[PDB]
Amino acid sequence: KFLVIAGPCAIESEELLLKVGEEIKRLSEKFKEVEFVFKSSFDKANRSSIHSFRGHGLEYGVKALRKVKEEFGLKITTDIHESWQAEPVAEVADIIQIPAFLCRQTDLLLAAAKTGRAVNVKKGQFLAPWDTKNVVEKLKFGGAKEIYLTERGTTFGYNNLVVDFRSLPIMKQWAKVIYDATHSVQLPGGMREFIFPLIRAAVAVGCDGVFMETHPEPEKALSDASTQLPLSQLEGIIEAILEIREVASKYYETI
Amino acid sequence: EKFLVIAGPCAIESEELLLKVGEEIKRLSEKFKEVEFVFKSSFDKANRSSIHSFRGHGLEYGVKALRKVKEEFGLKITTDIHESWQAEPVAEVADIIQIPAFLCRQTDLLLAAAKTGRAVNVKKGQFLAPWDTKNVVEKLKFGGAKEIYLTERGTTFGYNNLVVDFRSLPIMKQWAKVIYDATHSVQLPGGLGDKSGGMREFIFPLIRAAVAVGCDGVFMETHPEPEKALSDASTQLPLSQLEGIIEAILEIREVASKYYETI
Amino acid sequence: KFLVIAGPCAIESEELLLKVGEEIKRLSEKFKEVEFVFKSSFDKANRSSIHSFRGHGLEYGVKALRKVKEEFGLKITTDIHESWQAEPVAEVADIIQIPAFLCRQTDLLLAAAKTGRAVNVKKGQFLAPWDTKNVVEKLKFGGAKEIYLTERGTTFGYNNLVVDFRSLPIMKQWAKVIYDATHSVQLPGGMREFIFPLIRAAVAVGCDGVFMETHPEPEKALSDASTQLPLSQLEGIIEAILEIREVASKYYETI
Amino acid sequence: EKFLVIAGPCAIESEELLLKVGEEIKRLSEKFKEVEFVFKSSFDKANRSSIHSFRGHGLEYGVKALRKVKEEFGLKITTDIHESWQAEPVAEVADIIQIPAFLCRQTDLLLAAAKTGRAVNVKKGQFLAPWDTKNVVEKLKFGGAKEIYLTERGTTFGYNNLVVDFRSLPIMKQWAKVIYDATHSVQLPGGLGDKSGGMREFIFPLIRAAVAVGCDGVFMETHPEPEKALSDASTQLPLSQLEGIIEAILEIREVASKYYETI
Ligand SMILES: O=P(O)(O)OC[C@@H](O)[C@@H](O)[C@H](O)CO
Ligand SMILES: O=P(O)(O)OC[C@@H](O)[C@@H](O)[C@H](O)CO
């Protein structure tokens, strides 16, 4: 079924995770056709500034994510940054996420694949759509069986990303495809007004799921504040993409 | 508002070709009454990569052929001009004067089109940023144009490749009606060396994206037998596929429409 | 011999052309090894704004350019924008320039070639280096024998141009190559600090000449004010590129 | 200031390969006394496109081989790390710890390198703008790095292609010493599908441009027989050509030097 990966960018506190987790649980009950996966990073290991927020550590993070899964029965997903983190994270994460800058780091991919969990790789901003075939092969070699590739924009000049929707059908040849609606519009080192329009395009073109960072009060978020979707708008967007998908799916090309 | 579908053979290979395509477009205009069809075909391909490529049979022949299409089918007409002097003669038959992408910044060409009183559709140059079309529209308004369209046809992305930045649709909508060019956006500039390439497999998915995001019309080149086309043989849509594509975009437009943002 | 195309961007007045023409004449006498060509546009036909400066017309322009050639004995070059302008412009222009946005307009190229004059085509920001082979072929077909291709940057994301120096050796396979030092650093719809550094790169790589817009008081220029080189700095830069060329030429690759 | 030339085989195919290249680099260091040579070779290619490509013989073997080069020739050493734990063991032999381009934003890796007390050279990511390296240097300084280098190795330009924006040299010079990577800048990422491509014919012209613009050093991978290399066979410079290239860049640097702008 259609996948919806959502949650606050960073684990600012399990308190925050619970609030967002409650709303995602609610939507989960309203849209039984959709498979929801709660997402939040225990560490923002690639911030531009040394003075920016990273998180409260892996242990506190994994603990908070456990609280969400136990309290709401929602599947979990978080990203790893070094090989050693794969095992401990797999304890709670149903889907292990591979950062875009790290999509070519063989040992990280293998470490993730070895856990037995599903692996979602953010397509690097430097990668061409067809270059992801090799990424999937690394994971299959590592024992991975449920593999996802996420479209999150491609480097377009300086401090800008463009979404080449031709990537969706191309990547679909070797993996399930997820569209990252929030990072695709950010301006490296974004514009919220483009989030909805592009997510509509993604489902019209055809994908297997969408990824969206959401926060009760984006303006106060400690990470990606300019692009996180306000929690209150999540239901509306999900219903919208389901209706568009329903009509458009008739025309999705085979493989 | 009425959705615009601009379609026809890339080049006026012959008046016969035009009438064959026109017949089908007329049939579709009778079916899709919520669509305003405009028949398109260039009397001259003034910017081919190679000097040996097909250009056309001249302005005179071209206007005559287009007039026949309008006369026989009652279809609105659009064609592109390449130099200022062509605006006057073309305006006699063209309901919409089209400005080529490479020439979207040539002030006199824009002014020549604007003063004819006809609608003007400017292809956004592959070098232009979305927000920079504001001045293009300003020039047209300054020149007297009352109905203006901006067409998204891709942006230079590395060499011999174009990418469609759909953020351009809501941006350009701020100052003009927006049209999505479904066939030129997937072409590979200078791809085959002496000629440009293209990937037909992406025409349909990208047009679905265009209407989901929201535009005021689509532009599609269509030919009975693309493989035999004298220009853009790699991107022209088979004529038999036109009807299905249009129905599909009207369906996606309808369901997405309630979510189109207000500019 | 090494070509140096220089002059004010636009013909703001023949008065201005004479002042700049006097300095170019002087340098012409100081650097006998270099072939100087005076440049200035009679019309800026592609300004972004309808309210910007275009010029005083073709007649006034061609007249002013005549005054420079007659008074200083300097070769001339200006750009054309429509086919009909080729003939009248050829009366004074030794080199007919084809605008970057118009490098694929067949009739403009043919019209220029028909005049018998040399033709310099600005490589479009949308063109790949190898795509210029076809441009040269159009000119040869039109009777052109002295053909130049000018590097002026390539579209790199929005409102930015990058100079891919790989273009110099590539374009050299079918035409003499000129490097446009002033338009290559401008930001479409620039940065003067990069003019000298990149012109040094151009000669180190290897080219047949350089193109530089110069004005006595750039800040007051009616066109490309942010990138026009101050007249007083022209001599220094020319001497610099000659010294670099002298040493580097030993390593220029054959064809 | 003394010009830096970082050179060596892309990967530590064998200790034998290292000694053969090291011998030549040592010979050149005796000739070009105004140059500070640093021998480079990766103990692991941790980011190959294909799982079937050569990676290396492990950290242990690698450090041992590099130590032999430093021991036999008295040459400074540099190699790249891929995860934080590798900084400590590598620092035992590496005079300069190199940070891979894809990892230029991984805070812990940068910090791990900085605290070793060794110099740190960061390859500018293909996704990074020149002005955004300011924060990269800030992180290193924060972590205790006292000698920092930023290496220009090209920027993503469309798919499977990189372009070198030489404006990056004077920009990055504002906060660190700048190195130009003459061999990676001409490679075509994922060019051959399972592996990356490259155009050797552009290595020399672009390095001439680098020194004309002005940098503090150059980085060049060299191999006795590039065609047999287990990594970057399309871009590694034949070892016999190294001497000529270095003489040429020193000559161009000298004549251009008086014109280098003051940051
Ligand atoms: O095939 P070549 O001659 O490159 O021409 C490209 C065509 O696709 C051309 O007529 C196009 O739309 C013009 O810009
Ligand atoms: O040949 P593939 O495996 O693509 O690897 C690219 C190499 O050029 C690679 O080791 C490179 O410099 C790493 O980024």
Short mmCIF file of N, CA and C in Angstrom, two decimals, chain A residues 13 28 41 43 47 72 78 84-86 121 125 136 161 171 188 197 211 219 224 255:
data_model
loop_
_atom_site.label_atom_id
_atom_site.label_comp_id
_atom_site.label_asym_id
_atom_site.label_seq_id
_atom_site.Cartn_x
_atom_site.Cartn_y
_atom_site.Cartn_z
N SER A 13 12.88 16.25 21.38
CA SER A 13 12.45 15.73 22.68
C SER A 13 11.40 14.66 22.41
N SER A 28 -3.50 7.63 10.80
CA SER A 28 -3.31 6.21 10.52
C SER A 28 -4.64 5.47 10.60
N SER A 41 15.07 12.10 13.21
CA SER A 41 16.50 11.84 13.33
C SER A 41 17.03 12.01 14.75
N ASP A 43 20.11 12.33 15.30
CA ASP A 43 21.26 13.20 15.13
C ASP A 43 21.32 13.83 13.74
N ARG A 47 24.97 19.16 9.69
CA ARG A 47 24.59 20.57 9.71
C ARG A 47 25.71 21.40 9.09
N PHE A 72 1.89 4.02 20.26
CA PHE A 72 0.97 4.18 19.14
C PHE A 72 0.95 3.03 18.14
N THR A 78 14.53 6.02 11.06
CA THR A 78 15.46 7.08 11.42
C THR A 78 16.72 6.83 10.59
N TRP A 84 28.57 1.48 12.69
CA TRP A 84 28.28 0.94 14.02
C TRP A 84 26.86 1.22 14.52
N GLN A 85 26.24 2.27 14.00
CA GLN A 85 24.90 2.64 14.44
C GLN A 85 23.77 1.76 13.91
N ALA A 86 24.02 1.04 12.81
CA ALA A 86 23.00 0.19 12.21
C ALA A 86 22.35 -0.82 13.15
N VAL A 121 17.18 4.63 0.87
CA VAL A 121 18.35 5.47 0.58
C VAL A 121 17.96 6.80 -0.06
N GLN A 125 22.35 14.37 -3.99
CA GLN A 125 22.11 15.51 -4.86
C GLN A 125 23.06 15.50 -6.06
N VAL A 136 21.21 0.00 -5.25
CA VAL A 136 20.32 -1.11 -4.94
C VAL A 136 21.10 -2.42 -4.93
N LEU A 161 18.15 23.33 -5.53
CA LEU A 161 17.90 21.96 -5.94
C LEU A 161 16.71 21.97 -6.87
N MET A 171 13.99 5.21 -11.48
CA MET A 171 14.36 4.48 -10.27
C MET A 171 13.41 3.32 -9.97
N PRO A 188 19.98 24.60 -0.15
CA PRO A 188 21.24 24.25 0.53
C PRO A 188 22.08 25.46 0.95
N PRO A 197 2.50 21.84 -4.19
CA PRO A 197 2.50 21.72 -5.65
C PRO A 197 3.35 20.56 -6.17
N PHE A 211 7.45 11.28 1.59
CA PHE A 211 8.17 11.57 2.82
C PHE A 211 7.93 13.05 3.15
N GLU A 219 8.15 27.14 12.76
CA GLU A 219 8.97 28.32 13.03
C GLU A 219 9.88 28.16 14.24
N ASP A 224 15.58 22.40 9.95
CA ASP A 224 14.71 22.60 8.80
C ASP A 224 13.40 23.29 9.17
N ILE A 255 6.35 -0.67 -15.01
CA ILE A 255 7.79 -0.76 -14.73
C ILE A 255 8.62 0.40 -15.25
#
